[PDB]
């Protein structure tokens, strides 16, 4: 019934190895440093306000806000997120390889770390689509899902299984609602997983 | 034979403490933020292609590629690596202190995270040398080694033991082969460990 | 009584030669390109408004206004002048050599070229002082004068003659009134003439 010291050490070491591999141990074909990129003309407008002012030698120089690129970068400290106006928005990503998409990951900060006391800005209902080229207006539905505010920070979602699985190198994320924030919605990180084409 | 809850908690906590100390718990005298630096005129040419284009207000502005400085920076997400042309190359580092070198670390991404499906760009056979000054053409051999593509992401290598151990503040890493990639070789992080001189 | 063709040609050629020598044929020890400079912490505040907006790729980038440096630069097209608030102001200049100052020149545009129909922004009553060092609060009076709005564009003014003529390398121009403009006064060019010290 009980475990030995050697067995406990092996369990710990295996868990830290998986943690070190981007928490999941799975390729992220959206990650910017590995070859993913944002298709900027196909994203929602950024939530525009006068919040962050950058100065040099004491005089106002320019305002700063996060761009959609941060959604395909791994830092998820509070504020390292892209914000769009309201509760409906979209983001289009070009992947580092042509793949058969199998699953998607969304991360948000946990409530225990939020400096507003809530994660009401998190996405709630969303869907993912595959696009055959950068000009296609309506892509193929790959799945519809809900990010659970009472679940874990990192949540994974399985793509629909079809008889003929088409390959894609462009994916659209569409947000339909948030967890109640009345001004904006915040996206920390979106990942795309699957099998490369031969 | 079996372990208690208190014993398991202590094993877990000790493993996370070591993980938090740059995975190894050992000083890295090559790390740039702590005082290491690349001697740029003594590195191989960078693999030069038109891959990454940076724009501002919609118009092409300049191309981006990683520099040899990333080899002495800790982020090892896919693509946060220096690439040189072919399978023979070299990098020269000035250390943060004069030391007796005892060991070296090389990291590469695991195959499970590669967006190409392979780590054929990883270094294979390599050697490390100590240089007495920045103009010396041939340094003293500190060891010859092989990075194992079927081993762990982080691998450590022990320096040769000599009767009179000379101290060094400059080290050359020379790559002799890679794991098969036909165009380039990629280096994620190189570390240098040892005992400071009094 | 009458002149010959050869005599007329000689008169014309002599007049154009003098014109080509900065109109006066006299060294200007305040001229910036020859070694004069503005002592910025000893000038009046610049007339501050939102007039000239510079853009790049369509988005507002920064506002532009002329600095006191233009007063020691030779272009005097309309607008190539320094403006200060109201009708009292001052400018301090370091000269290219230590000299005995003998005379001063002020230029303003002629009324025939003003796009407002007037030269009411021109200086009227002014004085010039010599300063022994950059921290001296009250210098020695070198002369008090009036720029005549009904005179020529370029007007020259003779310094006071004293029994012991002190040498100076720093000069203050003080404006006491203008020709009626209710918001600002504009200075196109100020020159300083004299004999260098051995």
């Amino acid at each position: 019934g009980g475990i030995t010291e050697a067995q406990a050490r092996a369990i710990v070491n295996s868990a830290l190895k998986l943690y070190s591999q981007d928490k999941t141990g799975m390729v992220d074909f959206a990650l910017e440093s590995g070859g993913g990129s944002i298709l900027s003309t196909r994203c929602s407008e950024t939530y525009e306000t006068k919040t962050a002012l950058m100065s040099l030698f004491g005089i106002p120089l320019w305002y700063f806000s996060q761009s959609p690129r941060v959604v395909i970068q791994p830092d998820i400290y509070p504020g390292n997120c892209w914000a769009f106006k309201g509760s409906q928005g979209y983001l289009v990503v070009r992947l580092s390889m042509m793949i058969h998409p199998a699953a998607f990951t969304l991360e948000h900060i946990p409530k225990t770390l939020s400096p507003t006391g809530n994660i009401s800005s998190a996405p709630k209902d969303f869907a993912v689509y595959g696009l055959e080229n950068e000009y296609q207006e309506e892509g193929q539905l790959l799945g519809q899902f809900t990010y659970d505010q009472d679940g874990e920070s990192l949540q994974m979602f399985q793509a629909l299984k079809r008889p003929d699985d088409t390959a894609f190198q462009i994916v659209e994320l569409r947000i339909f609602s948030n967890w109640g924030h009345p001004e904006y919605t915040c996206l920390y990180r979106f990942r795309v997983h699957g099998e490369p084409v031969k | 034979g079996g372990i208690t809850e208190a014993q398991a908690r202590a094993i877990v906590n000790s493993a996370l403490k070591l993980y938090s100390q740059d995975k190894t718990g050992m000083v890295d005298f090559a790390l740039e933020s702590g005082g290491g630096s690349i001697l740029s005129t003594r590195c191989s040419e960078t693999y030069e292609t038109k891959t990454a284009l940076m724009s501002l207000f919609g118009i092409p502005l300049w191309y981006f590629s990683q520099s040899p400085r990333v080899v002495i920076q800790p982020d090892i997400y896919p693509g946060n690596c220096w690439a040189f042309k072919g399978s023979q190359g070299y990098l020269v580092v000035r250390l943060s202190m004069m030391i007796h070198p005892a060991a070296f670390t090389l990291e590469h991404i695991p195959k499970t995270l590669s967006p190409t499906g392979n780590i054929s760009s990883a270094p294979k056979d390599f050697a490390v040398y100590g240089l007495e000054n920045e103009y010396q053409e041939e340094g003293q051999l500190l060891g010859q080694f092989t990075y194992d593509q079927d081993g762990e992401s982080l691998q450590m290598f022990q320096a040769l033991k000599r009767p009179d151990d000379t101290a060094f503040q400059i080290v050359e890493l020379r790559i002799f082969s890679n794991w098969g990639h036909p165009e380039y070789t990629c280096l994620y992080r190189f570390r240098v460990h040892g005992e400071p001189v009094k | 009584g009458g002149i010959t063709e050869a005599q007329a040609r000689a008169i014309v050629n002599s007049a154009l030669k003098l014109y080509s020598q900065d109109k006066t044929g006299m060294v200007d020890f305040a001229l910036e390109s020859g070694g004069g400079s503005i002592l910025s912490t000893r000038c009046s505040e610049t007339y501050e408004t939102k007039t000239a907006l510079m853009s790049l790729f369509g988005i507002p980038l920064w506002y532009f206004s002329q600095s006191p440096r233009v007063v020691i630069q030779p272009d005097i097209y309309p607008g190539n002048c320094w403006a200060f608030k109201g009708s009292q102001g001052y400018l301090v200049v370091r000269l290219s050599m230590m000299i005995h100052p003998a005379a001063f020149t002020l230029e303003h545009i002629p009324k025939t070229l003003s796009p407002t129909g007037n030269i009411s922004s021109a200086p009227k009553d002014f004085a010039v002082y010599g300063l022994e060092n950059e921290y001296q609060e009250e210098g020695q009076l070198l002369g008090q004068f009036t720029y005549d709005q009904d005179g020529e564009s370029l007007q020259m003014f003779q310094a006071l003659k004293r029994p012991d003529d002190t040498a100076f390398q720093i000069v203050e121009l003080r404006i006491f009134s203008n020709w009626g403009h209710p918001e600002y006064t504009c200075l196109y060019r100020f020159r300083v003439h004299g004999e260098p010290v051995k």
Binding site: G35, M54, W62, P68 | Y47, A52, L53, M54, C81 | -
Partner: peptide, 19 residues
């Protein structure tokens, strides 16, 4: 005083980067 907004620097790949 107010400055402008820093446009988002944009990044695209003409071919895959080394990994």
């Amino acid at each position: 005083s107010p400055p402008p907004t820093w446009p988002h620097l944009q990044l695209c790949y003409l071919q895959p980067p080394p990994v």
